[PDB]
Amino acid sequence: QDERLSTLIHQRMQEAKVPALSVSVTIKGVRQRFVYGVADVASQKANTLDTVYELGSMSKAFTGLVVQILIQEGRLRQGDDIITYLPEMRLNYQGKPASLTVADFLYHTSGLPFSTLARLENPMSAVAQQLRNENLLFAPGAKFSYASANYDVLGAVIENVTGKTFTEVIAERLTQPLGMSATVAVKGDEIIVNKASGYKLGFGKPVLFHAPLARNHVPAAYIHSTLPDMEIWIDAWLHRKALPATLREAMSNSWRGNSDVPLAADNRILYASGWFIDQNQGPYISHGGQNPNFSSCIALRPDQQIGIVALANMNSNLILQLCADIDNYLRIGKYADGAGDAITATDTLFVYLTLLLCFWGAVVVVRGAFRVYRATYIIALAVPGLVAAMLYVAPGILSPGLDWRFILVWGPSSVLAIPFGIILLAFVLTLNHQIKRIL
Amino acid sequence: QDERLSTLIHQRMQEAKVPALSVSVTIKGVRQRFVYGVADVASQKANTLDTVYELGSMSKAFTGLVVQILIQEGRLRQGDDIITYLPEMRLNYQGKPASLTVADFLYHTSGLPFSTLARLENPMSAVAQQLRNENLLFAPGAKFSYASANYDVLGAVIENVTGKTFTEVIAERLTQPLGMSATVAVKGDEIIVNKASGYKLGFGKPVLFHAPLARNHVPAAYIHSTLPDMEIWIDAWLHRKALPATLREAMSNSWRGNSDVPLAADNRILYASGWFIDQNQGPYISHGGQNPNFSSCIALRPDQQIGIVALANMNSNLILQLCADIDNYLRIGKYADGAGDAITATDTLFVYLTLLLCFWGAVVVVRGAFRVYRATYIIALAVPGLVAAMLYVAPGILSPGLDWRFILVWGPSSVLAIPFGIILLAFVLTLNHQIKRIL
């Protein structure tokens, strides 16, 4: 290890307050490992190379590579209309049915809206039923939008074109040919040996969090792997002498950036079949994924054969910039200050605001007691009856299809205290107002 | 003109609601012009090629080129300590004096905090006095932060090293050798023939806005130019065959991206001496600038000898990316949907909220009048006395050195109505509460 790099790792881990962090750094054959923390705080399970982490959205790299393999063998083509493989699919743009090529989903130019993540994330029907009659945000091929639901359609395409369940396709095409020992696409809700227990921030400290793994979302997330397996993954991507010819050509095509999309002035990030492609001081080929209880980012710089990977036990934006920070250290020897984590900021904001609301409630209760001393129902509870519905419908008004389920799952666990905090404050305040009117 | 491109221009103009828009598009020698709108709504002054616009932050390209010319002649070096040219300068990091090279200011690695724009934007002494004992946000050379005030220090460096006022240095070095007919760096507040009157959004429509041009801020903004002048400017950055050798080599060095700064995962935008450098489908070399009452963004793609130059009569984020939309059209023939302009969004939000506050005030006044009809001072005005100070100090609490002057200058003119709206609402509400207590 480089002591400075290990200090970087520990600093980022402590600032993100994640229970465990696993980082591997490859430099043109030379490798370094950074395996730290506890895979489970509830039993102080020491974190180790053998523990399994959820890859999050990096799963899309595996799905993209599988689709590129299928394309190389000629079983599937980029220009194929999706109806050829998902006849049940119907998608609307301005109320008009829209034909989408497999390439449109492959490069996130399908126009599916981000709120679709909430509906496919539902454990619950194939992808067609969960996307039946969905209304697109934009025309196919006219824009780039990282709607995470896109690669589930690619999962259905893989399943139908190949005639097997996604897990078997993964095992046959990627895990076994690459010699990977533990990487697996779960068959939905499943138990795996020595999996690190997922954690999510709540009230300033990690909270053990687990939710069912939607069967239909695995082709875009929830692929499980170990750090040694991801080292083999990085090695397979960086250098390819031993690989089969079909696999090598599929990887070569996998990095072809989708140039035919409008690009904003300050972003110009190209997206290949799974990988962000950035030409600035690169090619800096990378992705990044935060699951509700896991986060992971991988970065490849093949021109210098540098490969980074950060698998973490908890969702936090800091371990999505962690691979960029490590690459910056390797390139320069300097790294930026830790970015303000959105999850941490939101959790601290809710701590402050719910504590303030409870203090407000205590103050109003004290004033009510004082007025009762100075003096010595359904009508009041109606106000909570309205506030409950108002808050229940509010997220759906702000965004279409945004269920409170999504907010509870993705946001910090303290988010729930805001609805109940507001409802309790309204309860006590309205009741005391009615009492004062009676008094 | 390409009719589709002209439609793009008109669409962006109408959505941004700018009084006037001037765009020139050069394609490997072939050129197109788009001169539209009125340079002044107060007199319907038809916008024309001869009208002068403020270049905003694309001025930094001129100052950067001047510094690079001085560097080529050997009068100045990148590694020179700033104290050599500004002995009056003192800057602190964690309370410790910090030595800054001229390169630090040239590539925005100085650590000055963006709020120094408010102090230098103040008409108000040299740059040293206005930056005397300033506290840096980060160590020199350790980070990239687009503190717009950086190039004013470079203006002082130019003046001291060259021994002339900045305007004369510009005229001698850039305007005259390049044959530019009207581009001039103003000597502070100055009157120029056929300048387009500045405009800023207010209550949903443009408002004629003019503020003094701080003399000390000219080396980083407020340089004036015409569209033919910017066409010559583009033809000088490209097609360098006819230029002097020293000027050619200065331009060659001017695009040298500062690689020694940490780069975020999703940005990786390199900054040369005035120009953002992007390798994605490029080199895409471009700056972009919004003044309080002007906006303009230039974009070059030398490998294909393309370059847009959009100058505008009004500040709006859309025309700060209309030289990226045009590149997208040229490259692909497709362009993205108009981004939500921050100025437009803020102005509409303040329209809604101040109208709601006035409606609230009317309702409370109506209830007070009813209670007066239901009935047949300094004590109440004290509440406004507190609210006034609370709102006055509030921006300074949120950010260091953020004067209400800055908010009024940069924000839409409706922003002032929020202080007064809140103060009037508190006035009427507290007065009616006191009256009810008396009643």
Side-chain angles (χ1 to χ4, degrees), chain A residues 189-240 242-246:
Chain A
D189 203 308
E190 227 182 85
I191 213 77
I192 311 191
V193 174
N194 291 0
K195 169 148 139 184
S197 298
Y199 279 89
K200 189 174 59 160
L201 191 68
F203 293 81
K205 58 176 178 284
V207 179
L208 200 161
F209 182 100
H210 203 277
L213 312 93
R215 187 182 175 95
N216 230 24
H217 203 50
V218 188
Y222 298 122
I223 298 183
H224 289 53
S225 286
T226 83
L227 192 72
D229 272 358
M230 211 65 37
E231 283 175 346
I232 317 294
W233 181 240
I234 281 186
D235 292 355
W237 280 98
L238 288 178
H239 42 57
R240 308 176 190 152
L243 307 185
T246 181

Side-chain angles (χ1 to χ4, degrees), chain A residues 137-138 141-143 259-270 277-282 284 286 301 320-321 324-325 327-328 331-332 334-337, chain B residues 137-138 141-143 259-270 277-282 284 286 301 320-321 324-325 327-328 331-332 334-337:
Chain A
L137 181 63
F138 52 86
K143 212 175 185 285
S259 54
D260 169 322
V261 289
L263 301 172
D266 64 345
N267 200 271
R268 296 200 155 226
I269 220 65
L270 305 176
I277 314 299
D278 192 351
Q279 301 296 343
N280 292 293
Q281 304 304 117
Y284 176 81
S286 65
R301 192 141 60 75
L320 277 170
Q321 309 306 318
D325 293 342
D327 229 19
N328 283 294
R331 187 169 59 85
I332 299 160
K334 284 189 276 279
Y335 48 86
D337 292 355
Chain B
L137 171 73
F138 51 86
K143 209 174 184 283
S259 54
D260 169 327
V261 291
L263 300 172
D266 64 343
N267 183 297
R268 295 202 155 226
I269 220 65
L270 305 176
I277 313 299
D278 191 351
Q279 303 298 340
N280 293 293
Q281 304 305 111
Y284 176 83
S286 62
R301 193 138 59 75
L320 187 66
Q321 287 176 15
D325 293 346
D327 247 13
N328 281 292
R331 189 169 58 85
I332 301 158
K334 285 189 277 279
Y335 48 84
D337 292 355

Side-chain angles (χ1 to χ4, degrees), chain A residues 395-411:
Chain A
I397 302 300
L398 295 173
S399 297
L402 192 143
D403 293 341
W404 261 104
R405 190 31 58 154
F406 183 89
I407 272 283
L408 294 165
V409 167
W410 269 70

Side-chain angles (χ1 to χ4, degrees), chain B residues 168-192:
Chain B
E168 187 173 331
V169 201
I170 287 287
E172 183 182 331
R173 295 299 197 161
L174 278 37
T175 326
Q176 289 168 7
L178 295 184
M180 305 212 34
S181 66
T183 291
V184 47
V186 295
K187 298 92 165 149
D189 203 308
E190 189 174 354
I191 216 81
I192 313 191

Side-chain angles (χ1 to χ4, degrees), chain B residues 77-93:
Chain B
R77 313 296 329 191
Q78 275 148 63
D80 290 339
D81 182 337
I82 195 69
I83 201 75
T84 278
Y85 303 128
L86 283 81
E88 295 175 350
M89 182 67 75
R90 193 172 171 220
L91 294 173
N92 307 313
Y93 175 37

Side-chain angles (χ1 to χ4, degrees), chain A residues 256-364 367-369 371 375-376 380-390:
Chain A
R256 196 141 300 290
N258 183 27
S259 54
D260 169 322
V261 289
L263 301 172
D266 64 345
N267 200 271
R268 296 200 155 226
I269 220 65
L270 305 176
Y271 193 95
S273 60
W275 297 93
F276 287 131
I277 314 299
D278 192 351
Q279 301 296 343
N280 292 293
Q281 304 304 117
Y284 176 81
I285 279 187
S286 65
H287 211 146
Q290 46 174 300
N291 260 16
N293 58 342
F294 291 90
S295 60
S296 325
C297 81
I298 170 175
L300 302 175
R301 192 141 60 75
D303 276 17
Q304 299 202 332
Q305 298 196 2
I306 297 192
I308 318 181
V309 53
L311 313 178
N313 211 154
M314 146 173 199
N315 180 14
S316 179
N317 188 63
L318 279 164
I319 317 187
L320 277 170
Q321 309 306 318
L322 179 56
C323 41
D325 293 342
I326 295 164
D327 229 19
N328 283 294
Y329 180 88
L330 295 177
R331 187 169 59 85
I332 299 160
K334 284 189 276 279
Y335 48 86
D337 292 355
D341 171 33
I343 298 299
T344 301
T346 285
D347 186 61
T348 289
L349 169 61
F350 292 155
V351 166
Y352 285 175
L353 202 136
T354 61
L355 174 46
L356 181 145
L357 293 205
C358 197
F359 168 83
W360 181 298
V363 167
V364 55
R367 191 168 69 182
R371 273 188 209 182
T376 297
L381 270 57
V383 168
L386 183 146
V387 173
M390 191 75 38

